[PDB]
């Protein structure tokens, strides 16, 4: 019903996660409760089984910064995130493509277009 994302807290966890991928391309969803756009994203777009298959070759990560605590802000500052929602993409060597940041809501279709601008 929901996509399978491994949770991350610290920037370390992210960097270690990029190592564990090695080769696979990566997607990082920042998430919070107080971010409606994020829960909208989760429920409508990541359920859609077209999306789900375009990501089946792609490793899936999620940070929950709902707490906006110190480890949450350090992560966000280091990543240079301005506000949620924000979704980050990495090529197989673990370098973010910043062009391909998503900073807003998208439906199943629009997302799959942006997955023609990934990696």
């Amino acid at each position: 019903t929901h996509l399978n994302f491994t949770q991350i807290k610290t920037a370390f966890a992210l960097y270690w996660a990029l190592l564990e991928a090695q080769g696979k391309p990566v997607m990082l969803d920042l998430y919070a409760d107080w971010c409606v756009a994020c829960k909208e994203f989760e429920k409508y777009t990541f359920s859609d089984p077209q999306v789900q298959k375009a990501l089946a070759d792609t490793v899936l990560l999620q940070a929950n910064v709902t707490a906006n605590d110190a480890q949450d802000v350090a992560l966000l500052k280091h990543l240079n995130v301005l506000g949620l929602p924000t979704i980050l993409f990495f090529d197989g060597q673990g370098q973010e493509h910043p062009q391909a940041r998503v900073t807003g809501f998208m439906d199943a279709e629009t997302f799959s277009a942006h997955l023609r601008d990934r990696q």
Partner: protein, 86 residues
């Protein structure tokens, strides 16, 4: 991904973050390794991709005073240099 037997030292570390096995997949070894660094807090709080092993078993085991998690291949080789295969 594929099955491997950690050498005495990499096993002694691995048992320390709650692995009880003698034979692991790769993704496992990488996971329990990440955990050891989180546990002992061997990463710099400012630049979290930087790891200080000088003065810790991981230094002796990787044979470097420090490294960046950003250098995937190097770490992969430092690990593999402590395994064997079924």
């Amino acid at each position: 991904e594929t099955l491997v037997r950690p050498k005495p030292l990499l096993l002694k570390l691995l048992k320390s973050v709650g692995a009880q096995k003698d034979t692991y997949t790769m993704k496992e070894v990488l996971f329990y390794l990440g955990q050891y660094i989180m546990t002992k807090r061997l990463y710099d709080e400012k630049q979290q991709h930087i790891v200080y092993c000088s003065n810790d078993l991981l230094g002796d085991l990787f044979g470097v005073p420090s490294f960046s998690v950003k250098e995937h291949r190097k770490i992969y080789t430092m690990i593999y240099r402590n395994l064997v295969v079924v």
